[PDB]
Amino acid sequence: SAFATCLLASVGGNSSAVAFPNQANYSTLVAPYNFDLLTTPSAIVWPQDTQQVAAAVKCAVDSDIKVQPKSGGHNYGNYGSTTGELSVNLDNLQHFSMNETSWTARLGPGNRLGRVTELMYNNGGRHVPHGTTFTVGLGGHATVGGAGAASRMHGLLLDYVEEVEVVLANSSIVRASKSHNEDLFFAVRGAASSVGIVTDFSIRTEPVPVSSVTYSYIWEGTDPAARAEVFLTWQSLLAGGSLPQHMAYDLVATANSMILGGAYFGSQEDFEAFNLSSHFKVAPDVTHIKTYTNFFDFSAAASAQTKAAGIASPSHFYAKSLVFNQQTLIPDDAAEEVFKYLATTKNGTDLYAVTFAALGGAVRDVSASETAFYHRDASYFMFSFGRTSGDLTDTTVQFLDGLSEVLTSGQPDAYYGQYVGNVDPRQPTDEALTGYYGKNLHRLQQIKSAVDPNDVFHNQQSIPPLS
Amino acid sequence: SAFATCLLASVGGNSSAVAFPNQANYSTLVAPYNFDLLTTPSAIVWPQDTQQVAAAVKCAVDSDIKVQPKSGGHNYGNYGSTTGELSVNLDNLQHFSMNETSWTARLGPGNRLGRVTELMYNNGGRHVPHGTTFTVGLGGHATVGGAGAASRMHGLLLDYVEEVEVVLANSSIVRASKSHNEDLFFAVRGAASSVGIVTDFSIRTEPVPVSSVTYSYIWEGTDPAARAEVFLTWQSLLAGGSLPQHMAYDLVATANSMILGGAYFGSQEDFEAFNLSSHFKVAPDVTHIKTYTNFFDFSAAASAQTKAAGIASPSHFYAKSLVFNQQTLIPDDAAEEVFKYLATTKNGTDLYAVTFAALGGAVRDVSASETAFYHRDASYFMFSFGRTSGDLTDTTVQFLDGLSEVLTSGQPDAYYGQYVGNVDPRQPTDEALTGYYGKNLHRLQQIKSAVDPNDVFHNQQSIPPLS
Ligand SMILES: *[C@@H]1O[C@H](CO)[C@@H](O[C@@H]2O[C@H](CO)[C@@H](O[C@H]3O[C@H](CO)[C@@H](O)[C@H](O[C@H]4O[C@H](CO)[C@@H](O)[C@H](O[C@H]5O[C@H](CO)[C@@H](O)[C@H](O)[C@@H]5O)[C@@H]4O)[C@@H]3O)[C@H](O)[C@H]2NC(C)=O)[C@H](O)[C@H]1NC(C)=O
Ligand SMILES: *[C@@H]1O[C@H](CO)[C@@H](O[C@@H]2O[C@H](CO)[C@@H](O[C@H]3O[C@H](CO[C@H]4O[C@H](CO)[C@@H](O)[C@H](O)[C@@H]4O)[C@@H](O)[C@H](O[C@H]4O[C@H](CO)[C@@H](O)[C@H](O)[C@@H]4O)[C@@H]3O)[C@H](O)[C@H]2NC(C)=O)[C@H](O)[C@H]1NC(C)=O
Ligand SMILES: Cc1cc2nc3c(=O)[nH]c(=O)nc-3n(C[C@H](O)[C@H](O)[C@H](O)COP(=O)(O)OP(=O)(O)OC[C@H]3O[C@@H](n4cnc5c(N)ncnc54)[C@H](O)[C@@H]3O)c2cc1C
Ligand SMILES: Cc1cc2nc3c(=O)[nH]c(=O)nc-3n(C[C@H](O)[C@H](O)[C@H](O)COP(=O)(O)OP(=O)(O)OC[C@H]3O[C@@H](n4cnc5c(N)ncnc54)[C@H](O)[C@@H]3O)c2cc1C
Ligand SMILES: *[C@@H]1O[C@H](CO)[C@@H](O[C@@H]2O[C@H](CO)[C@@H](O[C@H]3O[C@H](CO)[C@@H](O)[C@H](O[C@]4(O)O[C@H](CO)[C@@H](O)[C@H](O)[C@@H]4O)[C@@H]3O)[C@H](O)[C@H]2NC(C)=O)[C@H](O)[C@H]1NC(C)=O
Ligand SMILES: *[C@@H]1O[C@H](CO)[C@@H](O[C@@H]2O[C@H](CO)[C@@H](O[C@H]3O[C@H](CO)[C@@H](O)[C@H](O)[C@@H]3O)[C@H](O)[C@H]2NC(C)=O)[C@H](O)[C@H]1NC(C)=O
Ligand SMILES: *[C@@H]1O[C@H](CO)[C@@H](O[C@@H]2O[C@H](CO)[C@@H](O[C@H]3O[C@H](CO)[C@@H](O)[C@H](O)[C@@H]3O)[C@H](O)[C@H]2NC(C)=O)[C@H](O)[C@H]1NC(C)=O
Ligand SMILES: *[C@@H]1O[C@H](CO)[C@@H](O[C@@H]2O[C@H](CO)[C@@H](O[C@H]3O[C@H](CO)[C@@H](O)[C@H](O)[C@@H]3O)[C@H](O)[C@H]2NC(C)=O)[C@H](O)[C@H]1NC(C)=O
Ligand SMILES: *[C@@H]1O[C@H](CO)[C@@H](O)[C@H](O)[C@H]1NC(C)=O
Ligand SMILES: *[C@@H]1O[C@H](CO)[C@@H](O)[C@H](O)[C@H]1NC(C)=O
Ligand SMILES: *[C@@H]1O[C@H](CO)[C@@H](O)[C@H](O)[C@H]1NC(C)=O
Ligand SMILES: *[C@@H]1O[C@H](CO)[C@@H](O)[C@H](O)[C@H]1NC(C)=O
């Protein structure tokens, strides 16, 4: 109530821009993305502008309550709605301006990737490297890393972040950039969730590609040996360097299929001239190759595609991540043991997928320690996702847990990272911060401690301050 | 007896190619570089060629004895003469030849840097980046990394080593390169000390620069703030990215002087043109700028100068290192305490010196994962030498340790790299390993277990196999 009364004041009266757990729509406003890890925030507030985020944050500090902003909602732990914390919903901070001269656009955190793409296209045929899912909010994406079709070509979205507006724990409003509050700006570019609320983004852009070529080779068949041949091929090609740099290169494995897919930027001619499927021992069953000029159509198509697969909507699920680089590639034996594992473990899923997103090229162009993002030298990501038509059961966890154990069990005591966009709230808090942040974890405790000594910005796997 | 007989065999009966501790020659054959960390190896063997290294190594292996090769001898611990281990003195492996066509040279490990410099110039006016001191042996140099005048313009020494010949701890003789036993080639170029004896190098060469421009600026005086000013201008001048690529940039500090050393590759007008001195506050008490057209003369004065410096000789001494970078660029507050500490701490020396030396330039055309050399994103090193009239005492140990700290008070807990060419045997071992190799400590620990499971090539701080 002391808290409930100024939180009304932060949003200048508007009773429809603030909401408390006693009401009945509260379950539905909290809008959980993971259907199993339901959370009850202490309140929810929809600030209008930056002073209102500053105000709301003090409201929580005055009543010893911790804070997590929610932009787009896609955190698998639902940390945007951390229970008994203030949930600052940024859906109104959706501003977008473009500079026809620098081509540096200026967006608010509540912009969802779909609207960032439509606007950067319409306002001067621009785009920027980012993820494929159009419902990903920008606030939580530019700040964790943001990889996608154009990443091997151009890098992480956060490489194109030039300046941010940060609201701090003590409610100050600062800017940050490579020239001004360097350290803060280091943490906001990979770990913003733990140091402040980013309420506006200066993001450089690229010009869109003239010809985007999607491609989708398939192999049906539940035979481990054939599947490990596909994988080992893909992994070995990638580790080749025979591949083009400006070519995205995914590989998704379901129960019953292997899906080499990706996008090449350049003419459909030259792609086929790479005869990409030749390099594989067995030929694929199906071959979808499409060439888009309109780049927003390429983007919305691929956003649509992941949604239709069933791995992009709020659901009952659990998922984990892994980073593999040159030193840590998966052995020939290990592969076989893997797909062997997949075929024969009860998994408990109405649908599962395992994605191998390639991740070299322009991503390597930035120092491991220049951003909070640590995995610059990574060769490919591994995201594992287990949907269940029922509630999640401890069956499905062990399936995915074991899937990580086997995937690394070709070198199990080495260093494997995790993407902090694909949080995994089913693992020891100590193990998490290590995979997420790796060696940057300590500099991050240095900064955390200095711009948020209490833990005002806190979640299950937030960065905790020094001792 | 068994061991001694086999070992006379390995050198084909030349009984003056084997030295045992019972002989009066012995103490001196060991030829200790540090006079405090003395040592007694359980034999010294002087092989003529590869076949005799390989046979020498098995003699040790068959008597459950461990092995270290000696080349130049510049290991501050005296690791080539480790106590109770076999010392494989490579003095007789000074083979040289230059292919005019490729200007690639094929040397043996015994070649000191002096002889290497000379023989390259003379056979086609070639050189190859390396340490300034001429008494350093190629053997334990091109394997730890090897940096001197032309590194920020051409790279480390090991960035020119093409192929190698290696005696593996099972006495097999194998070659290595980027496209052959690559897992080995990696470890040879960073911590050969740990994985084999190299008995032949294939180094590419550059042609010699037509004009070299040694220079120096001296700030006599003991005022610590006055000096600290000197340095913090020096730290700030390097980080500006203002300086040329083809130009080294030292800065040494003693009990009363701040010598700003370096070279420059080009004409004299220009180096003065640049007015290196200008950027500084108090102008320098003294200046020299000699121009060497002849490069060997240039290298040979440089080497010879370090000798007269007093540091680069066998002696009673102790000495340590630290790497630094944009992120731990020492702060102004502590930088003062440094010189106040230098000026105030009972240093127990008769001569002390603290060498900051630039890096980057081209040192960063090679990923830290591409050689066993991991501190490749460094801005500058620090070598702290501290000599003593007669035996070393705790007083002097502690002085450099304390100094080591008072440098680190900047961010006392950040990752501070040590340099493996400047070893430090008065710190705990876990401490060392992480300093020398860091990120790669693991990957080397793989390769070490593949090609030396029984840890035949061991020194007080050598890479170990996994557990
Ligand atoms: C009191 O508080 C409430 C909430 O804080 C205030 O109401 C909020 O603000 C506006 C006012 O109605 C609402 O606007 C959004 O919702 C509409 C209905 O769903 C959308 O149609 C609308 O979109 C259109 O206009 C935008 C231009 O501003 C444009 O960006 C839109 O594209 C959007 O499309 C979808 C919508 O499904 C969205 O997911 C996309 O990401 C994209 O942004 C489209 O052209 C607005 O997006 C807002 O919903 C509403 N929030 C509530 C009620 O919770 C109310 O005004 C305050 N009273 C005051 C201040 O006095
Ligand atoms: C809300 O929290 C914010 C985060 O905690 C607070 O902001 C931080 O405030 C501190 C203190 O104001 C800032 O620290 C520095 O402050 C000044 C500014 O120096 C800076 O700019 C210089 C050049 O422009 C650079 O050379 C510096 O490296 C630095 O970037 C400095 O004078 C300070 O140094 C002094 O610090 C103490 C005494 O203050 C001494 O021990 C030192 O020896 C030295 O004399 C600090 O380095 C910090 O920049 C700032 N950070 C951000 C992100 O805003 C904010 O105060 C707080 N708001 C409240 C409480 O209302
Ligand atoms: C279906 C799906 C597909 C995805 N695909 C990709 C992909 O291809 N590539 C990729 O890189 N990632 C991908 N992601 C992951 C996404 O990048 C991250 O999960 C990110 O955390 C989601 O951002 P959000 O704002 O939408 O989520 P949220 O839950 O709102 O935010 C996630 C975290 O960021 C914090 N945060 C939110 N807004 C701010 C802000 N303004 N300032 C500071 N902290 C803030 C929150 O507090 C929370 O801790 C995908 C996620 C999903 C659900
Ligand atoms: C005065 C001085 C100046 C220096 N200046 C520089 C400089 O400017 N730049 C720079 O980069 N370094 C410099 N060094 C460092 C030098 O590279 C290292 O100290 C190096 O380890 C010593 O080489 P060494 O072969 O002469 O001595 P050693 O003690 O014989 O060898 C050093 C280590 O390598 C091992 N080793 C030797 N030969 C072989 C071989 N053939 N195969 C495998 N392992 C082997 C030895 O076992 C030992 O542990 C300097 C050293 C000194 C003493
Ligand atoms: C390993 O994982 C794979 C993929 O998850 C499993 O095989 C797949 O999982 C399910 C096996 O039970 C099958 O699930 C769905 O089948 C049909 C659609 O094809 C679907 O209608 C079923 O749902 C209902 O029967 O649907 C109704 C109406 O929608 C609801 O009342 C409720 O959802 C019902 O339960 C069922 O959800 C799936 O078809 C199947 N596909 C393939 C290609 O294998 C393996 O079983 C897993 N291995 C294990 C568990 O050992
Ligand atoms: C048996 O003993 C030795 C085996 O290692 C070896 O002696 C070495 O001989 C080399 C060259 O013959 C000498 O090298 C150099 O000596 C002076 C010193 O200033 C240099 O200026 C010269 O250029 C010369 O090349 C070494 O002094 C010597 N080393 C040792 C340890 O004795 C013998 O050649 C071996 N003899 C046989 C028959 O095998
Ligand atoms: C801090 O370091 C200074 C240099 O590292 C040191 O000054 C040096 O002091 C020694 C001995 O006090 C002098 O050496 C003298 O001793 C030798 C030994 O035989 C004799 O031949 C001579 O008497 C010789 O001069 C050095 O000359 C002197 N060097 C310099 C540059 O000052 C300080 O003593 C140290 N401060 C302390 C320990 O508080
Ligand atoms: C002495 O030790 C040597 C290293 O420990 C060892 O050489 C190693 O031999 C293995 C076995 O072939 C090689 O490993 C790989 O060789 C090829 C190339 O990938 C594959 O076909 C194999 O299945 C295996 O994965 C190593 O490359 C090789 N190491 C080096 C440095 O050449 C010798 O065999 C040992 N000699 C003895 C015991 O007499
Ligand atoms: C949520 O409930 C409050 C009152 O409990 C109501 O005023 C508000 O309009 C509701 N949200 C809607 C209808 O979206
Ligand atoms: C592409 O590769 C296929 C499969 O290996 C093979 O038929 C041929 O080399 C290429 N196809 C063409 C040229 O039509
Ligand atoms: C030292 O060892 C023996 C005995 O002193 C002697 O014959 C030999 O020639 C000497 N060799 C060296 C290198 O001093
Ligand atoms: C460098 O700057 C000084 C500043 O007084 C000036 O006198 C001098 O002429 C400039 N050029 C050279 C080559 O010293």
Numbering used by the authors:
A (entry chain A), B (entry chain B): 5 to 471
The authors write:
Sorbicillinoids are yellow secondary metabolites synthesized through an elegant combination of enzymatic and spontaneous biochemical processes. The flavin-dependent monooxygenase SorC and oxidase SorD are crucial in this interplay, enabling the generation of a diverse array of functionally complex sorbicillinoids. SorA and SorB work in tandem to synthesize the hexaketide precursor sorbicillin, while SorC and SorD are involved in the subsequent oxidative processes, including dimerization and oxidation reactions.11,12 Specifically, the monooxygenase SorC catalyzes the oxidative dearomatization of sorbicillin to form (S)-sorbicillinol. The oxidase SorD can then use hydrated sorbicillinol and oxidize it to oxosorbicillinol.
We also obtained the structure of SorD with sorbicillin bound at 3.0 Å. Even though sorbicillin is not the actual substrate — it lacks the hydroxyl group installed by SorC at the C5 position and the additional hydroxyl group from spontaneous water addition at the C6 position — it does mimic hydrated sorbicillinol and binds on the si-face near the N5 locus of FAD in both monomers present in the asymmetric units. Binding analysis using microscale thermophoresis also showed that SorD could bind to sorbicillin with a KD of 1.2 ± 1.6 μM. The electron density was most pronounced in chain B and gave an indication of the preferred binding manner, where the alkyl chain points toward a smaller side pocket lined by hydrophobic residues Ala151, Ala153, Ala252, Ala361, Leu363, Phe385, and Tyr423. Residue Phe387, located on the si-face of FAD, is important in sandwiching the sorbicillin ring between its own aromatic side-chain and the isoalloxazine ring of FAD by π–π stacking interactions. Other polar residues present on the si-face of the FAD in SorD include Tyr80, Asn426, Asp254, and Thr359. The C4–OH of sorbicillin can bond with Tyr80, and its C2–OH can bond with the pyrimidine-2,4-dione part of the FAD. The critical observation is that the C6 carbon of bound sorbicillin is in perfect alignment with flavin N5, should hydrated sorbicillinol be placed in the same position. In this binding orientation and assuming an anti-addition, the 6-hydrogen would point toward the flavin N5 atom for hydride transfer, whereas the 6-OH group would be oriented toward Asp254 and Thr359. The former two residues might function, directly or indirectly through water-mediated interactions, as a catalytic base that promotes alcohol oxidation.
